[PDB]
Amino acid sequence: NGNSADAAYAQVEIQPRANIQLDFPELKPYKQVKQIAPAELEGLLDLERVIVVTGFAEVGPWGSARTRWEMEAFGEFSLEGCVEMAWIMGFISYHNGNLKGRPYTGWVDSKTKEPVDDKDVKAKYETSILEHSGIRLIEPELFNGYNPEKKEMIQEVIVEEDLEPFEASKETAEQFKHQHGDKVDIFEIPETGEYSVKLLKGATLYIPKALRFDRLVAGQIPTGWNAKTYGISDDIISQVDPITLFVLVSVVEAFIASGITDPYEMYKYVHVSEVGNCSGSGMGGVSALRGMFKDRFKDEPVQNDILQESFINTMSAWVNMLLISSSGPIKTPVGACATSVESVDIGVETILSGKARICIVGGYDDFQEEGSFEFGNMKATSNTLEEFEHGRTPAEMSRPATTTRNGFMEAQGAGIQIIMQADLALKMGVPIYGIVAMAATATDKIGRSVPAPGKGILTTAREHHSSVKYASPNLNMKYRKRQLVTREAQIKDWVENELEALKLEAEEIPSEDQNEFLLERTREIHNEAESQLRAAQQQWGNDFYKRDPRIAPLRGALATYGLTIDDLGVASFHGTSTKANDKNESATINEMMKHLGRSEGNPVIGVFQKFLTGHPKGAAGAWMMNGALQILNSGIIPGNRNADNVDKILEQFEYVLYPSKTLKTDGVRAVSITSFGFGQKGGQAIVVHPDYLYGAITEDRYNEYVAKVSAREKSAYKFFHNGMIYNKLFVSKEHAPYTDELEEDVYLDPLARVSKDKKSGSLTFNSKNIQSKD
Amino acid sequence: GVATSFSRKKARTFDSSWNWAKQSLLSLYFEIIHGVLKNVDREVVSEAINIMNRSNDALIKFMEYHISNTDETKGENYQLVKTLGEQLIENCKQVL
Amino acid sequence: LITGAGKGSIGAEVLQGLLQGGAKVVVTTSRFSKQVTDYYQSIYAKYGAKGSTLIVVPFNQGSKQDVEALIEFIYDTEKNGGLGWDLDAIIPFAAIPEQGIELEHIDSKSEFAHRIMLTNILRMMGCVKKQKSARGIETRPAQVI
Amino acid sequence: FQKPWFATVNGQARDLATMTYEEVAKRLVELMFIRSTNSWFDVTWRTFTGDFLRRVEERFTKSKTLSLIQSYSLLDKPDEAIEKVFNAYPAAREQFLNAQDIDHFLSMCQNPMQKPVPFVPVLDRRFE
Amino acid sequence: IADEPVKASLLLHVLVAHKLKKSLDSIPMSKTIKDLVGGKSTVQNEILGDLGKEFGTTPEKPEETPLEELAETFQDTFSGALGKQSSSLLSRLISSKMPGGFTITVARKYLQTRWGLPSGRQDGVLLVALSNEPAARLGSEADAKAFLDSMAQKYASIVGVDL
């Protein structure tokens, strides 16, 4: 029956192609989100005073947030993971065109230029991907040939017998004379015009030797990561410190994850002078320091302006020169290992003070030879030789809340969130990943140990308990809702009485100038009626517990949204893998939960993300903030897989659990993030499931938002895939959104907003829309 | 073949059952809810054994709380977990 | 103490029982590594009953220098760096597969096997005895299976 | 003109990048499937719309599966083929063309062993 | 072969190439100093500062004029003179790269023996060698001979002479 009965009997297979999703939050129908929040929350909260996390990204030893989350929560990459990690690590490159005649579109290998199917990526690369990702042996290539097994340092010797004469230029011989004095002899060679130098007995000299240093492993950004891959040009790469690349790439990635592909689109809604850069570091460009300090000393070729690239706040500068071109607040904090948490807190306040309505917050810190050495002398980093004697492979050398923990695995990179006013987030229809319920920092006590972890942050649970006979009605939200209704009635009366008064004044005004006067005063009465409503809403909705010592700031933050103290499902511990910190953290949490009156047997689940990523110092709290947000949106709590045996000392802490494998919950309502930097830097930050927010808005508003996000998620997803294939996710602005002439006009006008220029197509400031009556 | 493999520093300890019990109960609870385990699974009895064997006060308080706060009106799977819990609480208190 | 209890052997299922029974075990592995400890970690989380302790050590039963060391490490005091234990049962199930080796092919591999499965088992009992006698222990005999 | 702008949805201008996979597959049928004769005007235009559906399957499947359109004979009832494919992958109703799938589309638009497609998919140097 | 004093249109072209950390060919000769380095005005005033030490006198706004007609304005007062800056950079190049046993002296007389190139040719060969710094301590004398050989062929290409 021929091969025709068997070719029609054969079935065509379909092979799956990577479809890397941005993973925006899943928006429920209004009916469902209205059930989870209490019904009395509607129009209770001022949404200007609510801070939401509206987009997050990181550049870490596991690539982006999406791959790092994949590896943290599932311990392996799916197709979409393997492609993204292969593309990040420059194993694969996209190629549209002709290849050996026939026209090919899709991935190719970066080296061979062989076409690679998506199915075949996991077979071909997922070995090499996992072999050059995360915590592994320090790879010299990545750190200017630094090999911690053979660490160069120079030693002075006093020469005991004169050297062979060596030729040098006149200026060089001169500088040898000025250094060594009589201990050197310089003699011009007539014909050539060059000198002959001869160091004499008693002259200094410096001989290079090697030291075999013992911290051989580190949390390194994957081998083959390259800023060009995102679309940063060589001029930027050459000028700036590598840290500045991380930040820049993290910031464009965060913006994309916020749906905002063009940063100027912010200026359709806000004044240039409200887009804040409240994001800091630990030691800034240490590569540029190591230049000016040690490469200059050896007189190596080093860019003349290497100083400017080493300052903590230079990274915030470059982002704002290349991407944002704002005149918003720029508060760069320094908080050693808790910077990321300080930068949230500053941001939060920077929006609640009103000086800004959007901060770029988060941390970022490089790993370099100088650092890795000084931390090893301090004995804070885990001695890799000792670990090898204990049979620890590199992966498993960061193992928080473990018996056998000795010290932290250092790592590098950046994390960036974008926080906003909820009101403005809904108005722009950006995705909301979380609510920043509180952020706080504290100092511990007098003491003569800088790196000492301490229990200052405990003061987030501070409250009074001497008069708890009867329930405080100030927590009973219904009471609060009543009082807000009582106020908005007075507001009503006030607006009527002011509209009367206006009419009365305007009657005596001449008829020609009447219109102008009424417009100007009707705006100001609308302004004051808003101001009074938001002040009420702020008094009852948000700031009900600021002036009440019987409510803790930690209880206060949850109680804003109707949540009890029991709801705080997850605490994301600092969890460095060092003997003092992990015990001090646990005790502190445990004592906060115990004081506030967490129900017995309702522990917080501990997340120790640093077991995978290691400790990026400045950026630690910005990764835990990303690890929170993705938990809050997945309801999945990743296990500390390196928690082989939880430390018997931590059993005494009743309100703490130490999972060793991923728990796929039915929901997480809130997540604590605690960090303890060097120098008594203690920070805490509470993030709440964004769904609670939607309780506070009407059905119509919600649905209008949902539409605008759905559109802005599609447009993001388009921009993300177009940027990724052709390496143009990064596109530095060439010009500000205003010509040099209008700068003054744009800054002075509070209500200047960018409009699409039809000719160019891009967003710019229009001279019509500056000091405009409309 | 006669290479020295043994070293005392390579000795690994696992002793912290006290924690693992609470994790191993919480994995059950959410597996029952997400209906990965039914009411006809010998795994539900296996788990129940392995929890009981690690009964203490803290574990009984950790169950009592999680099971008592289950919302039986959210689904069928919630009624299943709430019954099983209540029974497994009574077990652990007996074999403590 | 139980040897030859790597994943998917009879030892593995015994170990699951002993830990389920609240026993204090030393399981020895001849392929020690990250994957192996993580496996034993999972086994103890799931099964490891209250009072139960699991100690995973690398071990090459085919060496006498490892066999005398192991027992010296188990029996020696917690001050010296030993476990401070006293064995109630030994289950030396360590073995290596030999297949299609008739009389005439007995070589290195066969000799080594015999040394794991017989001679070094005897040296293990032998070594325990020596430790028990030395510490003056005569009413706590180590069941060998 | 006789070759209309392809990236049109109900009569508003778009681009291949701002159309869903659904929108594109409907617009293809509309421009390449003649209702009156109940046939594809050119078998190469059917093959075109069959490759595009096989590309949608590939993009929105999770694991290796059989092809829903085993033979391009099934396309002879295009509305049933589309409904069937987009029922199986309903995420491809709401998700704009993956940049790679745009390039693949425009790459099929220059296949030299097919009839030149009755539209202009893109404004570039090969517009003329 | 006969000597020829080097041209300002090579000295100003190698200087800009070196400072901008760029290849000699990647510089378009008819393009303003302010256009090459437009963003970072700091490296612009470092170009000016070097050109000042190189050829002394500088015209009014040399930054709005392309390098092309700025090379001929500078050519007026210059006559085969390396200057202190270029001499300092050549001294810098040799000390850091060329290995022990290969100083300027023997490099000059290697250019004289191998190629026949005298002073005015030699100092042009050492300029294109600085334009493409090897950025790696020359391993051996032999490797460095191939290095000078190759950057004497680039000197022969740019001038238009046979060897």
Side-chain angles (χ1 to χ4, degrees):
Chain A
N1 308 280
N3 309 341
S4 64
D6 291 327
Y9 175 59
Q11 291 72 26
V12 170
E13 307 193 286
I14 288 304
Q15 293 290 25
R17 309 184 97 96
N19 188 202
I20 300 156
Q21 292 307 321
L22 294 196
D23 284 286
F24 281 46
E26 194 179 314
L27 283 160
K28 296 160 161 183
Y30 183 70
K31 194 46 60 202
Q32 287 182 53
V33 297
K34 199 57 184 173
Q35 290 155 17
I36 70 161
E40 308 77 67
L41 192 60
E42 209 194 307
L44 180 54
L45 309 197
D46 174 9
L47 297 162
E48 276 184 279
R49 303 300 294 254
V50 167
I51 305 305
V52 296
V53 162
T54 201
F56 67 91
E58 69 173 78
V59 165
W62 286 103
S64 80
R66 292 172 300 269
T67 52
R68 187 266 308 139
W69 172 255
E70 200 137 355
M71 201 68 197
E72 189 200 351
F74 312 109
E76 73 171 288
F77 299 121
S78 67
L79 185 52
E80 292 84 338
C82 283
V83 164
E84 173 162 17
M85 281 293 291
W87 174 78
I88 284 168
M89 289 185 68
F91 287 133
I92 64 179
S93 331
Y94 170 82
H95 171 247
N96 182 19
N98 299 340
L99 206 73
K100 294 161 302 199
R102 73 210 79 77
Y104 179 91
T105 295
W107 296 119
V108 301
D109 193 316
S110 296
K111 307 217 72 180
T112 73
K113 305 291 166 200
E114 215 73 4
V116 180
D117 301 311
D118 284 305
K119 50 143 170 185
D120 293 346
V121 164
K122 194 193 167 307
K124 191 137 177 211
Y125 299 119
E126 204 212 23
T127 300
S128 320
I129 284 169
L130 292 168
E131 193 164 293
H132 312 313
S133 287
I135 294 167
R136 65 199 178 278
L137 294 157
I138 291 162
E139 302 181 4
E141 306 84 53
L142 295 177
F143 310 115
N144 301 285
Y146 158 44
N147 178 14
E149 266 285 34
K150 176 178 183 181
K151 161 176 179 72
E152 296 288 318
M153 198 45 189
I154 60 151
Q155 193 224 37
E156 69 94 351
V157 299
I158 296 305
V159 64
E160 61 256 43
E161 186 164 23
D162 299 14
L163 274 78
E164 59 202 27
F166 72 94
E167 178 160 62
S169 74
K170 180 194 209 74
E171 59 276 4
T172 306
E174 284 288 62
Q175 284 167 340
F176 272 122
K177 191 67 215 167
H178 188 186
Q179 170 50 41
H180 295 279
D182 278 358
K183 297 301 200 312
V184 74
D185 289 345
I186 54 159
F187 298 132
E188 194 165 319
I189 302 159
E191 64 282 19
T192 70
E194 313 288 13
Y195 284 63
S196 61
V197 187
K198 179 184 214 80
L199 277 298
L200 317 179
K201 175 164 62 181
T204 316
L205 194 68
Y206 279 106
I207 308 176
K209 54 183 177 190
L211 174 60
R212 322 308 158 178
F213 188 44
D214 39 32
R215 274 67 179 180
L216 311 174
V217 173
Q220 301 162 81
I221 284 160
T223 310
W225 194 96
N226 187 301
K228 296 197 67 48
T229 318
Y230 290 79
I232 301 162
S233 44
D234 312 284
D235 61 347
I236 294 161
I237 289 160
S238 48
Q239 176 66 43
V240 310
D241 182 303
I243 194 171
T244 298
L245 302 177
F246 302 156
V247 179
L248 278 169
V249 165
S250 290
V251 167
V252 297
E253 275 211 313
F255 266 110
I256 285 158
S258 190
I260 304 166
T261 75
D262 178 2
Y264 292 166
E265 194 211 344
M266 286 188 286
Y267 307 144
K268 294 178 94 191
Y269 302 84
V270 302
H271 182 34
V272 286
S273 86
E274 291 185 289
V275 177
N277 196 358
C278 314
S279 61
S281 157
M283 294 151 280
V286 295
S287 207
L289 293 178
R290 179 261 295 151
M292 69 193 259
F293 271 65
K294 163 184 132 173
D295 286 344
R296 198 77 80 193
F297 177 58
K298 303 195 283 151
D299 201 11
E300 302 305 325
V302 170
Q303 71 183 121
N304 193 16
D305 48 68
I306 194 62
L307 180 52
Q308 88 179 60
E309 304 302 319
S310 72
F311 299 145
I312 299 305
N313 74 298
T314 302
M315 282 63 92
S316 285
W318 275 121
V319 166
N320 193 34
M321 291 178 171
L322 289 184
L323 290 174
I324 311 304
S325 272
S326 76
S327 83
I330 172 158
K331 308 158 153 188
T332 303
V334 187
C337 308
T339 295
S340 330
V341 179
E342 189 165 16
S343 48
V344 175
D345 179 36
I346 285 174
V348 165
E349 299 286 70
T350 311
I351 298 173
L352 269 61
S353 77
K355 292 222 188 79
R357 299 164 79 199
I358 311 176
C359 277
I360 304 161
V361 311
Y364 39 84
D365 210 328
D366 203 339
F367 155 95
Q368 279 297 316
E369 169 192 1
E370 280 65 48
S372 177
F373 189 50
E374 285 308 316
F375 278 123
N377 302 350
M378 265 195 167
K379 301 179 50 52
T381 48
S382 62
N383 180 346
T384 297
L385 286 195
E386 208 167 327
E387 302 301 282
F388 284 150
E389 315 318 319
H390 292 52
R392 296 284 184 192
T393 65
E396 79 179 319
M397 280 179 202
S398 195
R399 49 191 184 284
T402 312
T403 298
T404 66
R405 73 192 179 287
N406 211 18
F408 63 87
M409 200 57 81
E410 192 175 342
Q412 50 173 330
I416 296 303
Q417 302 75 63
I418 295 178
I419 57 159
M420 296 178 52
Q421 308 181 320
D423 184 82
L424 170 62
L426 294 165
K427 182 165 139 56
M428 289 225 295
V430 291
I432 294 168
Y433 290 81
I435 286 175
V436 176
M438 70 169 293
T441 61
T443 60
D444 307 317
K445 196 172 189 300
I446 63 179
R448 309 289 185 272
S449 198
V450 167
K455 304 172 74 73
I457 202 66
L458 191 51
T459 69
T460 66
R462 74 182 183 279
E463 73 175 14
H464 205 258
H465 277 148
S466 105
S467 301
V468 299
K469 168 176 43 159
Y470 300 149
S472 63
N474 215 73
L475 279 178
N476 186 53
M477 196 160 66
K478 275 149 170 292
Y479 166 65
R480 298 211 310 282
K481 186 43 176 287
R482 197 173 78 219
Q483 297 303 282
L484 184 61
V485 173
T486 289
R487 193 64 185 76
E488 73 70 44
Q490 187 157 331
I491 290 170
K492 181 182 300 302
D493 277 323
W494 180 95
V495 166
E496 283 150 16
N497 298 17
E498 274 298 316
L499 279 183
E500 281 286 333
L502 180 44
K503 176 263 295 191
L504 296 186
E505 270 187 13
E507 275 176 321
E508 295 93 41
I509 299 302
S511 66
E512 74 275 359
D513 200 72
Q514 191 162 290
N515 198 232
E516 167 256 20
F517 171 85
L518 294 173
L519 294 175
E520 275 196 340
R521 294 273 297 153
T522 286
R523 192 54 167 77
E524 286 283 355
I525 286 161
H526 183 280
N527 264 325
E528 271 112 26
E530 183 251 335
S531 272
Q532 279 183 86
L533 170 61
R534 311 311 266 289
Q537 282 182 273
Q538 168 183 338
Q539 191 182 14
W540 292 114
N542 298 60
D543 309 13
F544 65 94
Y545 64 87
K546 259 52 172 194
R547 68 200 278 192
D548 196 338
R550 287 193 54 199
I551 313 173
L554 179 57
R555 173 160 273 143
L558 298 174
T560 303
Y561 305 95
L563 303 188
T564 81
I565 196 60
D566 287 343
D567 284 304
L568 191 61
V570 176
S572 212
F573 283 46
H574 211 50
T576 43
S577 181
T578 81
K579 285 152 161 298
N581 180 80
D582 287 26
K583 196 199 154 300
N584 170 62
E585 190 149 35
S586 305
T588 291
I589 292 294
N590 192 65
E591 191 57 29
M592 287 162 43
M593 294 331 295
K594 194 180 315 310
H595 182 64
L596 276 181
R598 185 78 157 198
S599 310
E600 294 174 17
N602 184 17
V604 302
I605 304 179
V607 175
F608 294 91
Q609 185 197 42
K610 288 199 183 55
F611 79 78
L612 181 65
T613 63
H615 184 95
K617 306 173 292 288
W623 294 357
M624 282 179 294
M625 169 60 75
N626 301 357
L629 296 161
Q630 293 153 329
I631 281 163
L632 271 176
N633 291 296
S634 305
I636 305 174
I637 318 178
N640 177 4
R641 296 199 294 283
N642 289 167
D644 72 345
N645 186 55
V646 181
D647 185 8
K648 178 57 149 185
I649 301 312
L650 307 172
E651 177 163 46
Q652 72 171 301
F653 301 128
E654 300 307 320
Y655 301 119
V656 187
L657 184 72
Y658 295 90
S660 77
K661 62 173 182 284
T662 295
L663 269 300
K664 192 202 145 64
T665 73
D666 70 321
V668 182
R669 275 167 294 285
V671 184
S672 158
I673 308 158
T674 63
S675 311
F676 311 102
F678 282 52
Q680 308 190 21
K681 286 275 172 165
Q684 179 154 41
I686 305 292
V687 189
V688 178
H689 201 297
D691 275 322
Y692 283 90
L693 183 58
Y694 308 140
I697 56 170
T698 78
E699 187 151 356
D700 285 287
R701 190 161 191 190
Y702 180 80
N703 276 324
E704 183 209 339
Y705 166 82
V706 173
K708 293 175 75 66
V709 165
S710 197
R712 177 182 293 280
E713 193 274 300
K714 295 200 222 193
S715 289
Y717 165 89
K718 175 183 68 182
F719 178 81
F720 172 73
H721 273 274
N722 184 16
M724 181 196 165
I725 66 168
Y726 299 136
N727 301 319
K728 65 173 272 204
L729 289 177
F730 192 90
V731 171
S732 93
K733 297 295 177 189
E734 63 290 358
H735 321 300
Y738 39 87
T739 65
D740 192 79
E741 293 86 321
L742 295 187
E743 193 161 52
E744 309 310 337
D745 312 3
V746 158
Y747 289 155
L748 287 173
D749 174 349
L751 297 180
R753 299 291 170 278
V754 296
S755 65
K756 210 159 187 155
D757 172 45
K758 55 209 67 57
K759 260 71 187 178
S760 74
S762 52
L763 300 173
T764 69
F765 281 92
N766 195 347
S767 181
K768 301 171 183 168
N769 310 333
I770 296 162
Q771 292 295 331
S772 203
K773 192 67 168 297
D774 64 350
Chain B
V2 298
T4 54
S5 187
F6 182 94
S7 82
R8 299 181 157 210
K9 289 207 284 284
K10 286 192 176 222
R12 293 281 164 71
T13 300
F14 312 93
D15 80 294
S16 44
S17 64
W18 52 271
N19 190 78
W20 300 147
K22 284 186 286 187
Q23 170 177 242
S24 285
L25 192 125
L26 204 63
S27 73
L28 181 67
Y29 182 73
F30 288 126
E31 284 210 309
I32 296 299
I33 286 169
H34 290 131
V36 181
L37 299 176
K38 306 303 191 297
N39 190 32
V40 303
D41 286 327
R42 298 223 182 179
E43 199 53 34
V44 164
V45 177
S46 285
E47 285 303 305
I49 278 169
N50 279 126
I51 296 149
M52 287 171 74
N53 280 347
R54 299 180 287 199
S55 174
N56 60 63
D57 182 69
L59 175 59
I60 290 157
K61 291 311 172 223
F62 171 76
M63 293 163 76
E64 280 168 305
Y65 175 91
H66 275 286
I67 301 309
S68 92
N69 294 296
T70 310
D71 195 25
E72 70 296 346
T73 75
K74 195 170 285 304
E76 185 272 340
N77 278 326
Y78 292 84
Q79 185 56 86
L80 169 47
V81 80
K82 183 150 201 183
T83 308
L84 177 63
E86 275 156 351
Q87 186 43 250
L88 198 49
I89 281 160
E90 274 309 290
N91 291 349
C92 284
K93 269 171 168 171
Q94 283 191 51
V95 293
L96 176 60
Chain C
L1 170 64
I2 172 162
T3 73
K7 181 175 203 152
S9 80
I10 298 160
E13 287 294 359
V14 164
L15 178 64
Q16 283 192 16
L18 288 168
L19 289 179
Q20 205 159 17
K24 295 186 171 182
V25 186
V26 174
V27 63
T28 77
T29 181
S30 21
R31 299 126 284 177
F32 190 96
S33 51
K34 176 132 165 67
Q35 189 273 311
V36 166
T37 65
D38 260 19
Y39 155 77
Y40 282 112
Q41 190 265 316
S42 87
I43 300 319
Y44 185 79
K46 169 156 211 215
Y47 287 112
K50 70 204 180 166
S52 79
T53 321
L54 180 65
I55 315 295
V56 182
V57 296
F59 192 59
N60 176 10
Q61 190 158 287
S63 158
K64 87 167 177 197
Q65 300 172 119
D66 288 320
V67 160
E68 71 203 11
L70 179 47
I71 305 306
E72 198 65 12
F73 160 68
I74 282 171
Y75 267 89
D76 213 323
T77 75
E78 288 153 312
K79 215 64 62 198
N80 298 300
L83 295 187
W85 283 19
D86 177 31
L87 300 182
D88 270 359
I90 301 164
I91 305 179
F93 279 11
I96 60 169
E98 312 161 70
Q99 274 155 310
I101 309 170
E102 192 80 292
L103 301 170
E104 68 182 30
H105 302 308
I106 288 179
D107 209 45
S108 206
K109 185 207 184 166
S110 321
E111 187 170 9
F112 186 65
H114 190 75
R115 189 190 207 226
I116 291 166
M117 307 206 281
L118 172 58
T119 318
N120 279 42
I121 291 191
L122 302 187
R123 281 196 184 85
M124 207 184 310
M125 271 169 284
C127 196
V128 163
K129 154 68 177 177
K130 264 57 156 190
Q131 297 303 312
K132 284 190 182 282
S133 271
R135 284 168 178 76
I137 300 174
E138 296 178 28
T139 84
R140 213 203 167 175
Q143 176 149 57
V144 185
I145 289 155
Chain D
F1 201 45
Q2 66 186 5
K3 284 179 154 69
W5 182 247
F6 168 77
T8 310
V9 184
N10 297 117
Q12 73 178 332
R14 301 291 205 75
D15 185 60
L16 265 175
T18 81
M19 292 177 75
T20 79
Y21 290 77
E22 193 155 49
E23 278 158 22
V24 168
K26 293 185 170 183
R27 184 55 160 165
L28 279 185
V29 169
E30 173 180 48
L31 273 171
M32 283 175 157
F33 186 70
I34 315 305
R35 297 294 183 177
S36 54
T37 75
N38 258 28
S39 48
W40 292 89
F41 189 84
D42 192 310
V43 75
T44 62
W45 290 356
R46 193 178 70 169
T47 302
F48 189 99
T49 298
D51 294 333
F52 181 69
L53 292 175
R54 283 225 170 101
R55 169 51 68 100
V56 173
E57 296 184 73
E58 290 177 276
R59 178 68 70 207
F60 288 97
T61 184
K62 307 305 285 281
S63 60
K64 188 262 286 184
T65 59
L66 295 180
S67 180
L68 290 185
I69 53 164
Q70 268 300 328
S71 82
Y72 291 162
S73 319
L74 275 82
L75 265 183
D76 289 339
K77 301 189 69 65
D79 305 337
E80 311 303 13
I82 288 174
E83 276 305 287
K84 184 181 143 204
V85 160
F86 290 102
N87 274 336
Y89 312 124
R93 292 204 170 111
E94 270 302 284
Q95 186 183 296
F96 289 162
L97 262 62
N98 189 298
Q100 288 155 26
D101 292 337
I102 292 163
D103 290 40
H104 173 76
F105 182 91
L106 285 171
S107 189
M108 288 184 293
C109 281
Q110 283 159 248
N111 188 39
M113 300 172 180
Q114 77 177 6
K115 185 170 179 76
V117 288
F119 41 80
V120 182
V122 71
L123 289 188
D124 61 349
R125 63 176 162 93
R126 295 176 327 287
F127 178 54
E128 191 257 9
Chain E
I1 183 65
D3 188 271
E4 52 213 72
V6 291
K7 320 313 306 181
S9 189
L10 197 144
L11 272 297
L12 311 190
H13 199 252
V14 62
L15 181 143
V16 62
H18 168 285
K19 182 55 61 69
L20 269 297
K21 296 293 180 70
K22 206 54 57 70
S23 73
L24 192 76
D25 49 35
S26 168
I27 300 300
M29 190 62 202
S30 179
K31 194 170 180 277
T32 71
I33 295 166
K34 197 214 56 155
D35 223 350
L36 270 305
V37 70
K40 39 163 200 177
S41 186
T42 292
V43 168
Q44 173 156 216
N45 80 64
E46 289 168 29
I47 296 296
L48 311 181
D50 266 1
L51 292 177
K53 314 300 152 282
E54 189 53 14
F55 283 26
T57 304
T58 64
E60 307 302 316
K61 193 70 166 78
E63 302 95 18
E64 207 79 10
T65 186
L67 296 167
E68 171 38 54
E69 72 265 58
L70 192 65
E72 68 192 346
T73 303
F74 272 67
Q75 183 70 85
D76 302 333
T77 64
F78 154 80
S79 301
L82 283 158
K84 308 322 300 166
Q85 215 63 20
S86 90
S87 306
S88 181
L89 269 299
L90 274 193
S91 307
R92 185 47 188 281
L93 150 88
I94 271 106
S95 60
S96 51
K97 309 287 126 240
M98 245 126 291
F102 228 146
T103 53
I104 345 232
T105 295
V106 60
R108 303 292 293 180
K109 268 69 78 185
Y110 174 72
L111 267 295
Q112 199 67 277
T113 52
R114 183 60 183 84
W115 299 117
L117 295 181
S119 295
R121 299 282 269 278
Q122 288 170 354
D123 85 353
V125 175
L126 273 299
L127 278 166
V128 61
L130 175 66
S131 86
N132 226 347
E133 272 149 312
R137 177 132 255 259
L138 261 330
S140 91
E141 261 71 46
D143 307 320
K145 285 182 189 296
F147 169 73
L148 298 164
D149 281 8
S150 70
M151 293 183 186
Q153 297 184 75
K154 264 86 77 183
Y155 180 76
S157 75
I158 193 67
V159 175
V161 298
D162 176 39
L163 316 171

